[PDB]
Amino acid sequence: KPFTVPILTVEEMSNSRFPIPLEKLYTGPSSAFVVQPQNGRCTTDGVLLGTTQLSAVNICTFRGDVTHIDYIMNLASQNWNNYDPTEEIPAPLGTPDFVGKIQGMLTQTTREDGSTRAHKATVSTGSVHFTPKLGSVQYTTDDLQTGQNTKFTPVGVIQNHQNEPQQWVLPNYSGRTGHNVHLAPAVAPTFPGEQLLFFRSTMPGCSGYPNMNLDCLLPQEWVQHFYQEAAPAQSDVALLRFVNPDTGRVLFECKLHKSGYVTVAHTGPHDLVIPPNGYFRFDSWVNQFYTLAPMG
Amino acid sequence: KPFTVPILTVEEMSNSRFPIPLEKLYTGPSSAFVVQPQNGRCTTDGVLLGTTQLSAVNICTFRGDVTHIDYIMNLASQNWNNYDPTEEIPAPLGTPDFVGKIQGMLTQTTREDGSTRAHKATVSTGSVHFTPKLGSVQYTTDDLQTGQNTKFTPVGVIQNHQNEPQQWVLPNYSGRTGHNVHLAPAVAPTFPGEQLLFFRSTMPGCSGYPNMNLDCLLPQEWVQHFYQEAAPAQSDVALLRFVNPDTGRVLFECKLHKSGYVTVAHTGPHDLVIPPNGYFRFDSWVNQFYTLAPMG
Numbered sequence: 330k331p332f333t334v335p336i337l338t339v340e341e342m343s344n345s346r347f348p349i350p351l352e353k354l355y356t357g358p359s360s361a362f363v364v365q366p367q368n369g370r371c372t373t374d375g376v377l378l379g380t381t382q383l384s385a386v387n388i389c390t391f392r393g394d395v396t397h398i399d400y401i402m403n404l405a406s407q408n409w410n411n412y413d414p415t416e417e418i419p420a421p422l423g424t425p426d427f428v429g430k431i432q433g434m435l436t437q438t439t440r441e442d443g444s445t446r447a448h449k450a451t452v453s454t455g456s457v458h459f460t461p462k463l464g465s466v467q468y469t470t471d472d473l474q475t476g477q478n479t480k481f482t483p484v485g486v487i488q489n490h491q492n493e494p495q496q497w498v499l500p501n502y503s504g505r506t507g508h509n510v511h512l513a514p515a516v517a518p519t520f521p522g523e524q525l526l527f528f529r530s531t532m533p534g535c536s537g538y539p540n541m542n543l544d545c546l547l548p549q550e551w552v553q554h555f556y557q558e559a560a561p562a563q564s565d566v567a568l569l570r571f572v573n574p575d576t577g578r579v580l581f582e583c584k585l586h587k588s589g590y591v592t593v594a595h596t597g598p599h600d601l602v603i604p605p606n607g608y609f610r611f612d613s614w615v616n617q618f619y620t621l622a623p624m625g
Numbered sequence: 626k627p628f629t630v631p632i633l634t635v636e637e638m639s640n641s642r643f644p645i646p647l648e649k650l651y652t653g654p655s656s657a658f659v660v661q662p663q664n665g666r667c668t669t670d671g672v673l674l675g676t677t678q679l680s681a682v683n684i685c686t687f688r689g690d691v692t693h694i695d696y697i698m699n700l701a702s703q704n705w706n707n708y709d710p711t712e713e714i715p716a717p718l719g720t721p722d723f724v725g726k727i728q729g730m731l732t733q734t735t736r737e738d739g740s741t742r743a744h745k746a747t748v749s750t751g752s753v754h755f756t757p758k759l760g761s762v763q764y765t766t767d768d769l770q771t772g773q774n775t776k777f778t779p780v781g782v783i784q785n786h787q788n789e790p791q792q793w794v795l796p797n798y799s800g801r802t803g804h805n806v807h808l809a810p811a812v813a814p815t816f817p818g819e820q821l822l823f824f825r826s827t828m829p830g831c832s833g834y835p836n837m838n839l840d841c842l843l844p845q846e847w848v849q850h851f852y853q854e855a856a857p858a859q860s861d862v863a864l865l866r867f868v869n870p871d872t873g874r875v876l877f878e879c880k881l882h883k884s885g886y887v888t889v890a891h892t893g894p895h896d897l898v899i900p901p902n903g904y905f906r907f908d909s910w911v912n913q914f915y916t917l918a919p920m921g
Contacts, residue, residue: 335853336853337679340703340704341679341680342680343680343681343682348644348682349682350680350682350683350703352704383633383637384637384638384639384646384681385639385680385681385682386639386644386645386646386681386682387646407636408636408648408901432743433780434730434745434780434831436780436781436829436830436831438827438829438830438837442786442834443786443787443830443835443837444834445781445783445829445831445832445833445834445835445837446830446831446832447728447780447781447783447829447830447831447832449730449745480829482781482829484729484732484743484778484780485732485741485743485778487741487743490738490739491739531734533734533741533743533776533778534732534734534739534741534742534743535730535732535741535742535743536741536742536743537741538738538739538740538741539739539741541734541739541741550849553846553849554853557631557632557850605704
């Protein structure tokens with residue numbers, strides 16, 4: 330099958346690491362960071378890696394029952410059935426993949442009356458009570474029956490300023506009980522001139538001076554597209570050109586490594602300047618020795 | 626181009642009328658209802674109708690500034706730029722398309738300190754202050770600077786029991802100022818044996834005895850797929866067969882009208898029983914006189 334990327338504009342896409350839309354394109358120096366994101370990890374061939382699942386709305390949500398202590402939720406699977414700690418994944422597909430406090434809201438229904446309730450609730454993925462893999466997560470909930478399906482819908486990050494969140498620091502899915510399992514390989518631009526092309530959004534902040542940025546390596550729909558299509562990597566890198574349908578002109582080119590990350594020939598930071606109508610286009614499969622035309 | 630539907634299982638898909646995953650397949654009697662949903666309306670040929678946009682995470686969100694009175698938000702566009710009441714759409718793409726109270730949370734950042742805040746907030750789309758089209762929406766917010774980007778993230782519906790929400794009753798996007806503009810055509814099964822095949826989810830409830838169901842005519846990804854693909858309607862109806870990859874057997878067939886709705890040959894209600902691994906498959910283009918093999 331022939332390879333393609335979706336004709337979606339950045340603003341028409343969604344961040345694969347938090348349920349919010351993409352806002353911009355950005356690139357900066359990697360060196361000092363880790364870049365082990367587990368969400369938004371997909372082989373361009375179609376292979377989902379890490380904790381990556383297809384739904385953009387289920388990223389960072391948690392379902393299950395809860396028991397009052399601030400509150401512990403014995404996790405269930407997205408579809409509300411039993412959690413299987415057996416699978417060979419880092420944690421439930423869609424689990425958060427950075428260390429931080431995520432404010433949201435807990436909601437439950439009592440199968441009995443049609444009765445319902447809702448309360449604010451936060452979750453620190455740094456806390457040693459953040460054990461998704463093992464099957465339980467603790468909410469520092471800022472009246473909650475047991476044996477009743479509870480759901481957590483994420484909203485933003487409530488986080489000395491800018492310190493949290495720690496976007497490139499992976500939480501411990503098994504917490505204290507053990508190291509992380511079956512992680513997606515870490516990313517780093519290898520070629521000389523090149524740097525990494527991120528896909529940034531701004532997680533809403535919910536109280537405090539949090540570092541609201543959030544970069545992802547692949548848009549949620551690229552993940553959804555490689556999954557459907559499953560186009561053979563007729564090469565180890567795919568040359569992408571970011572076109573503009575208004576002027577009909579190419580702005581910059583970039584590298585889509587079949588592994589699942591994007592690199593752009595640039596040194597130093599830069600909030601990528603682009604036309605709201607521009608989108609990426611698959612031109613050709615190239616060797617990893619292909620030097621890219623510099624970026625703006 | 627040849628027509629297709631995505632190989633996604635119901636649970637792998639998302640509801641196109643609220644940012645939550647699909648849960649089940651359902652069918653019941655239409656007659657007494659309207660069925661004028663504006664979200665999840667797409668021509669199978671690729672034409673988005675009503676207030677339908679591509680992002681499943683931006684359904685029911687509102688951005689803009691707010692001014693304390695409980696609170697009014699002068700709407701902005703998804704990308705945070707000016708709202709254009711000029712476009713020939715019923716309202717901002719993604720606006721809610723049923724009458725009800727939607728609880729969620731308002732969050733804002735103050736460009737100045739990195740300062741942030743968050744408070745619960747509800748919105749009644751029945752209220753005469755619900756004027757999306759005109760550019761303003763009022764929150765009955767259950768400390769909010771002005772001239773500061775505020776966002777509303779929806780969570781569930783806080784709604785004598787079961788009365789609200791009114792899933793098939795369209796809100797007035799211009800409120801009192803005028804009737805609704807450029808609506809997606811209403812739906813109804815025309816053929817004799819047939820009924821309408823919905824795609825149901827359960828909006829979380831956030832306080833009260835709300836009618837948490839929510840049916841949509843097309844999964845958000847079918848909408849995203851017809852948009853990419855844009856496969857010519859070589860006919861006015863497309864025969865779909867819901868297969869099971871485990872047993873390799875067809876369960877039931879259904880009608881995908883190029884208009885953008887699904888009909889199944891059945892009379893009376895029924896929570897469709899299906900294997901978690903089953904998915905739909907495009908078999909052939911047929912005439913509207915094709916009688917369907919009854920459904921379970």
